[PDB]
Amino acid sequence: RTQSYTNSFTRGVYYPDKVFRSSVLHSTHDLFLPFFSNVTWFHAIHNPALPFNDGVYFASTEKSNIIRGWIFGTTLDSKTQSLLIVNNATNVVIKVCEFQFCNDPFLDVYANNCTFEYVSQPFLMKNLREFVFKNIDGYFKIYSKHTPINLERDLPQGFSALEPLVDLPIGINITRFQTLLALHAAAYYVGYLQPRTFLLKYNENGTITDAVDCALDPLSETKC
Amino acid sequence: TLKSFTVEKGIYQTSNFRVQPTESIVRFPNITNLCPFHEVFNATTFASVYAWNRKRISNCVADYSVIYNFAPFFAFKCYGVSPTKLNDLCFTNVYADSFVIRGNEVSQIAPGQTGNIADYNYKLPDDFTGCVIAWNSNKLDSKPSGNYNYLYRLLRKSKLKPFERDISTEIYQAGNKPCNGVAGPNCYSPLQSYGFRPTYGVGHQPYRVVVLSFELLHAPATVCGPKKSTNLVKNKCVNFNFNGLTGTGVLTESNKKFLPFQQFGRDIADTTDAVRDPQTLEILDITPCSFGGVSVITPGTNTSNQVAVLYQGVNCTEVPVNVFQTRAGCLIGAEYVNNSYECDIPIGAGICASYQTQSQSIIAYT
Amino acid sequence: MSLGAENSVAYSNNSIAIPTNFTISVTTEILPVSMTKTSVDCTMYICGDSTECSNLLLQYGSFCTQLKRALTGIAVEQDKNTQEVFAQVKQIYKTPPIKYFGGFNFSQILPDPSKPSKRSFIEDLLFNKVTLADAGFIKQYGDCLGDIAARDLICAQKFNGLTVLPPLLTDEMIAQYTSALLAGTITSGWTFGAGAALQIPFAMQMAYRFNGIGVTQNVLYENQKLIANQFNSAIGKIQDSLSSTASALGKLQDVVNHNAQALNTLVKQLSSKFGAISSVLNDILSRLDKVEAEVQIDRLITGRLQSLQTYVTQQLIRAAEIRASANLAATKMSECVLGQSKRVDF
Amino acid sequence: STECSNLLLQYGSFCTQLKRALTGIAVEQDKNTQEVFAQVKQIYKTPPIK
Amino acid sequence: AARDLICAQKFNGLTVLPPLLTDEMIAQYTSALLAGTITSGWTFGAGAALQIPFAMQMAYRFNGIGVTQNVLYENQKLIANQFNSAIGKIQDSLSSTASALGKLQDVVNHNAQALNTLVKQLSSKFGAISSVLNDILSRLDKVEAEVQIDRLITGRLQSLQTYVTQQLIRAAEIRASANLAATKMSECVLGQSKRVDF
Numbered sequence A: 001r002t003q004s005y006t007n008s009f010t011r012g013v014y015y016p017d018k019v020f021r022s023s024v025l026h027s028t029h030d031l032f033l034p035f036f037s038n039v040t041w042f043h044a045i046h047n048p049a050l051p052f053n054d055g056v057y058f059a060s061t062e063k064s065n066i067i068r069g070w071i072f073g074t075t076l077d078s079k080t081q082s083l084l085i086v087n088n089a090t091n092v093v094i095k096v097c098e099f100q101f102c103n104d105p106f107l108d109v110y111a112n113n114c115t116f117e118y119v120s121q122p123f124l125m126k127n128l129r130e131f132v133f134k135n136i137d138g139y140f141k142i143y144s145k146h147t148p149i150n151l152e153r154d155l156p157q158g159f160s161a162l163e164p165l166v167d168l169p170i171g172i173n174i175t176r177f178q179t180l181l182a183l184h185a186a187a188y189y190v191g192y193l194q195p196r197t198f199l200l201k202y203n204e205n206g207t208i209t210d211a212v213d214c215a216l217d218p219l220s221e222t223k224c
Numbered sequence B: 001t002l003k004s005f006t007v008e009k010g011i012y013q014t015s016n017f018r019v020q021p022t023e024s025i026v027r028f029p030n031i032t033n034l035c036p037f038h039e040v041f042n043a044t045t046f047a048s049v050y051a052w053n054r055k056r057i058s059n060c061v062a063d064y065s066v067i068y069n070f071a072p073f074f075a076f077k078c079y080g081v082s083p084t085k086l087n088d089l090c091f092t093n094v095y096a097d098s099f100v101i102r103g104n105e106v107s108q109i110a111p112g113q114t115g116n117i118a119d120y121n122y123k124l125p126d127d128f129t130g131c132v133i134a135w136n137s138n139k140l141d142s143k144p145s146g147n148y149n150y151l152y153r154l155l156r157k158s159k160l161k162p163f164e165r166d167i168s169t170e171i172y173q174a175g176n177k178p179c180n181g182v183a184g185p186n187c188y189s190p191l192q193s194y195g196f197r198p199t200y201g202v203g204h205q206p207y208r209v210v211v212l213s214f215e216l217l218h219a220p221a222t223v224c225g226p227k228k229s230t231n232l233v234k235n236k237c238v239n240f241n242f243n244g245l246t247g248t249g250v251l252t253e254s255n256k257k258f259l260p261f262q263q264f265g266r267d268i269a270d271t272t273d274a275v276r277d278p279q280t281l282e283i284l285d286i287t288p289c290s291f292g293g294v295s296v297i298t299p300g301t302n303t304s305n306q307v308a309v310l311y312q313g314v315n316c317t318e319v320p321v322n323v324f325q326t327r328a329g330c331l332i333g334a335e336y337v338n339n340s341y342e343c344d345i346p347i348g349a350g351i352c353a354s355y356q357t358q359s360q361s362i363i364a365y366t
Numbered sequence C: 001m002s003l004g005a006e007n008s009v010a011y012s013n014n015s016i017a018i019p020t021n022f023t024i025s026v027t028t029e030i031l032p033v034s035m036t037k038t039s040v041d042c043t044m045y046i047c048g049d050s051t052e053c054s055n056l057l058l059q060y061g062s063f064c065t066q067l068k069r070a071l072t073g074i075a076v077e078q079d080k081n082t083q084e085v086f087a088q089v090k091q092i093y094k095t096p097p098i099k100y101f102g103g104f105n106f107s108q109i110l111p112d113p114s115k116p117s118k119r120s121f122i123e124d125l126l127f128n129k130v131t132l133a134d135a136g137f138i139k140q141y142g143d144c145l146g147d148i149a150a151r152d153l154i155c156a157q158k159f160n161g162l163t164v165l166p167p168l169l170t171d172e173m174i175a176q177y178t179s180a181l182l183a184g185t186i187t188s189g190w191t192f193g194a195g196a197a198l199q200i201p202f203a204m205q206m207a208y209r210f211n212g213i214g215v216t217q218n219v220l221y222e223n224q225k226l227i228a229n230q231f232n233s234a235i236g237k238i239q240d241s242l243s244s245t246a247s248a249l250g251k252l253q254d255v256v257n258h259n260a261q262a263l264n265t266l267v268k269q270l271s272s273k274f275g276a277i278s279s280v281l282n283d284i285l286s287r288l289d290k291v292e293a294e295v296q297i298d299r300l301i302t303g304r305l306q307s308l309q310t311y312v313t314q315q316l317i318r319a320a321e322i323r324a325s326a327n328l329a330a331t332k333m334s335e336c337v338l339g340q341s342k343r344v345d346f
Numbered sequence D: 001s002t003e004c005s006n007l008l009l010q011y012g013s014f015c016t017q018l019k020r021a022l023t024g025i026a027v028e029q030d031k032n033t034q035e036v037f038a039q040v041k042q043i044y045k046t047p048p049i050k
Numbered sequence E: 001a002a003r004d005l006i007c008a009q010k011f012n013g014l015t016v017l018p019p020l021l022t023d024e025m026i027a028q029y030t031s032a033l034l035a036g037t038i039t040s041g042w043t044f045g046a047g048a049a050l051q052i053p054f055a056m057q058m059a060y061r062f063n064g065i066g067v068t069q070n071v072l073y074e075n076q077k078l079i080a081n082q083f084n085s086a087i088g089k090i091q092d093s094l095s096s097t098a099s100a101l102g103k104l105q106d107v108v109n110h111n112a113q114a115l116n117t118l119v120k121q122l123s124s125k126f127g128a129i130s131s132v133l134n135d136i137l138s139r140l141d142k143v144e145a146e147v148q149i150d151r152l153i154t155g156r157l158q159s160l161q162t163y164v165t166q167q168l169i170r171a172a173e174i175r176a177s178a179n180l181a182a183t184k185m186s187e188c189v190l191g192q193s194k195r196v197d198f
């Protein structure tokens, strides 16, 4: 698949807790995507597994149901349990089994002893969709947001905080990452999280409207 | 407050007045099911240590006092919560982890612990809230010829993260020549048996271990202790109990726009400012009841035993118990005169008090 | 950095330089006098109407009694500073309804009776320039009850037991003392500061003042209109500098900023754990039995007590600095206003 | 030490106010020297005749 | 050779900052004040410097203290000789006696001793099993080392609190002395003072 490199443009900020704070400046230390980072852009017209390097920021600016599902694991060709998320217009199936992933796993539009299976409401709904995947203390945490987008060449300017969506007790080893494509031209952005300190601003309505890094430039350290 | 029997002329800050609560509120979500602790603690066989099984418990009323009737244990060993207060407070999920170990390695199940089971089989996190129940099982998990239905892992290429399972059986290699599925030189099978016998010592007996992993009130609560809810009363000083957290204050209707994943509001002193009702989808403020400081204005005890009372920073409508409203609060027991003398006892913003003859009485003036 | 302009004075053993004209210059000196008087409730700060915390706090003896004593002493000392600076004139003098003082215009420093708080133009500029913290000297529990917008800093200050006491002398009384001093200085001279006020024309008073500095008194009587015009222009320049520049009053604004910042730090210190499992006291009491909750409550009690002692110590040090400044301001009121000073740069 | 820093983060803002007090003293020393010595507007010179 | 005390102070986070005005600029300010006082008199403290001969300036100073100005004009050589001998006696007393400057030496000594005490306080246990943090880390598990490190943290924080409070009190004393020195510069150097023993 075609590769390009682009700037993060202060995207990838999520709510770190389920606590309402209004009109305050709060300092947190967590796995965040750093500001003005070097994220990578994939055009999948065509494919090994991507690394899962302490969390993944995922972005997709397309429409319809051409993008769905993810594969997380460390040896996807059996002999190790792996995490599978598959989407449709009605249901989300999340399964943690050994599975039999091939070299090019994909879903046709037209598997061993295991424990965790999950059925849920649809993850998915000029339409940029952002996801944050984190794996901490045996818990898999998925945050997301959907926003209107003007230009699909690059990531937009501004802030759009990502509300927490699903926490799971998966408890496996995740090293590599694979994206499922529906086959009867899809482009997506991938970035990696780092354990950084952020200073976040909650306005009078309790919404995060601004955030500052703490190791980007010396002015951010001064503001910390 | 002066620790004496004769006081001098002046104004003394004595104590603080507070409004005591009149009622009590308990608010728990309406759940009717019972948590299946009975089928967790008994089974024909539990699982092995390397393949320990985890049971999710949610959306039920949990009575923790019936656990003692289900197994003969002493060590109800707990870290972040007391065993006797598990019915008074509520969680969002309970996870029960079941395995059968050796009696010598029960001490490895603790936060911040290393070893063999704690590093290669079952690891507990450092911030572990939840607790461990272990009991001897020599009657059911032993055989005179040896018990080979329970397996454990010798060693791994790397340490094992908390709450992680690794059930795969691959031959370990500690050199350059590959094993290729052959357990030859520098190649060993990873799983071996306990081999239980009734003639072993007290440290080598089988032990059945159940670990209840509790996750706290960061989500809408599903697992609750047995308690009865009460009708919600507002605009009054009450003693509320919202999903296990206590407090004293006044509950009012809220204008805060909670996002649907949020149920708690927190102030800059890390105290709860707003709450969400667990029964109806309603947001309520928590404002503490009426309070303030009390100053006592007196002449000497050799002059008179009359006093005046200043309630600081409050109106005279707010105080429960000659009334004059100054800018330093308001004053009861001293009358206001339209005269101006030099200041004798300073009260506040341009107001003084004196003990004058116009019968002697305490007057206040500018 | 540059130390200053380079100059070379021409020294000779038979040459002198003698001035032929003069300027009348009005300068501004700003001196802090008092600060905010605060009172702290220990039980509402450390414990917050919890019975178990109060019962464990009763075993610590008399720490909170002596912190309350120190805060009360500071609060009395602030009113003492204001009294020794301003309340120094014996009687409340008044200016005559006629406003002729030899051509000298005192219109911007004499009070205006249109407004209720009878302050001058310059006093109103000084009051509007320094913004206040709007502290607890005005009651706010009715306003803290009505949940308008978000929770204020002052409401969260007073909800945790920190209160601001009002000063004894209101701003109207300080303006009245200032007007009495101004009327006595303009009408009588330096005679009202050493006995009874003896009236004198203002031109003859200024001739006496020129005779005090070594200039013969006919210089005023020949250049009176020029001196009066220079005084009026300097007063107008002072007014324009107050209307334009806002950074000249940084000392009083620094006092207000420090007094707000210390209380905000004291409130924000309540969110710390100090090694306990939680900062909320009720979570510790609900989650743990008696001995373990006693241990965690003791850790929280020690941390909050140390933070409160740090606040009281820095308040005492700042009170000593403010008292030294108020003693200087009282000396300057005694020696510059009530008389004529021969001390250089005083 | 990372563990010591993690345990020290639970004590709040004691370090910040210690740093603030020492910075205030450090600024005050320069203010003291400026108010004592820098009193003259211009740098005068003595003529070469003595 | 051996480890210095300054390196031991610097290796534990304690730093000495340089003053804004170097000694060359302090000497330049002092030289400007001396040149203005010698040439002009007190006229440079009220505006522009106005030149005057030094004998006539000293006659003005004699008229200030109540002596008629012809006394200086009749005893000028004797007065100049007495001034030169007094300046030479100040020279000799500064060359011989070394205990006259004890106040500035005490200012140096207190600030050295406070930092030495703060460094020496790092070897205390405060009830823990060791003063070394790494020995506590290596010799115990998580909870026990957390308890011992909490003890050491409280002890070190209390010692640093004591140091900062002592520095604040000494700063107040130094500010009072600097205010007195500024007043004596404005009144004794820039003019003639009538205050007795000032």
Ligand SMILES: *[C@@H]1O[C@H](CO)[C@@H](O)[C@H](O)[C@H]1NC(C)=O
Residues within 6 Å of the ligand: A005, A007, A038
């Ligand atoms: C991102 O990484 C690629 C890798 O070669 C590099 O070419 C590109 O300049 C980087 N983008 C930056 C530094 O903004």
Ligand SMILES: *[C@@H]1O[C@H](CO)[C@@H](O)[C@H](O)[C@H]1NC(C)=O
Residues within 6 Å of the ligand: A074, A075, A173, A174, A175, B158
């Ligand atoms: C588990 O993941 C880690 C990455 O942190 C990797 O180094 C290790 O090899 C993985 N273990 C297995 C058995 O795949």
Ligand SMILES: *[C@@H]1O[C@H](CO)[C@@H](O)[C@H](O)[C@H]1NC(C)=O
Residues within 6 Å of the ligand: A203, A204, A205
């Ligand atoms: C908060 O919501 C109100 C709703 O009426 C809106 O008027 C206000 O502008 C919002 N505040 C923002 C967007 O900062």
Ligand SMILES: *[C@@H]1O[C@H](CO)[C@@H](O)[C@H](O)[C@H]1NC(C)=O
Residues within 6 Å of the ligand: B038, B039, B042, B043, B070
């Ligand atoms: C254990 O629980 C089971 C429920 O599955 C019950 O049938 C059995 O009688 C119990 N045994 C004991 C000894 O409590």
Ligand SMILES: *[C@@H]1O[C@H](CO)[C@@H](O)[C@H](O)[C@H]1NC(C)=O
Residues within 6 Å of the ligand: B030, B031, B279, B280
């Ligand atoms: C709990 O109470 C709410 C409020 O009336 C109601 O909507 C809900 O159906 C109740 N749930 C159950 C399980 O009864």
Ligand SMILES: *[C@@H]1O[C@H](CO)[C@@H](O)[C@H](O)[C@H]1NC(C)=O
Residues within 6 Å of the ligand: B315, B317, B325, C142
């Ligand atoms: C409190 O007192 C003030 C001053 O008299 C008054 O204006 C206000 O209405 C009072 N508040 C009440 C009665 O709630």
Ligand SMILES: *[C@@H]1O[C@H](CO)[C@@H](O)[C@H](O)[C@H]1NC(C)=O
Residues within 6 Å of the ligand: C012, C013
């Ligand atoms: C006075 O100054 C002149 C030149 O400025 C010089 O020639 C003369 O010697 C001086 N007087 C005395 C007594 O030295």
Ligand SMILES: *[C@@H]1O[C@H](CO)[C@@H](O)[C@H](O)[C@H]1NC(C)=O
Residues within 6 Å of the ligand: C105, C106, C107, C108, C236
């Ligand atoms: C004094 O000044 C004010 C404003 O500066 C001016 O309005 C007034 O006319 C002046 N007084 C006289 C007598 O001119």
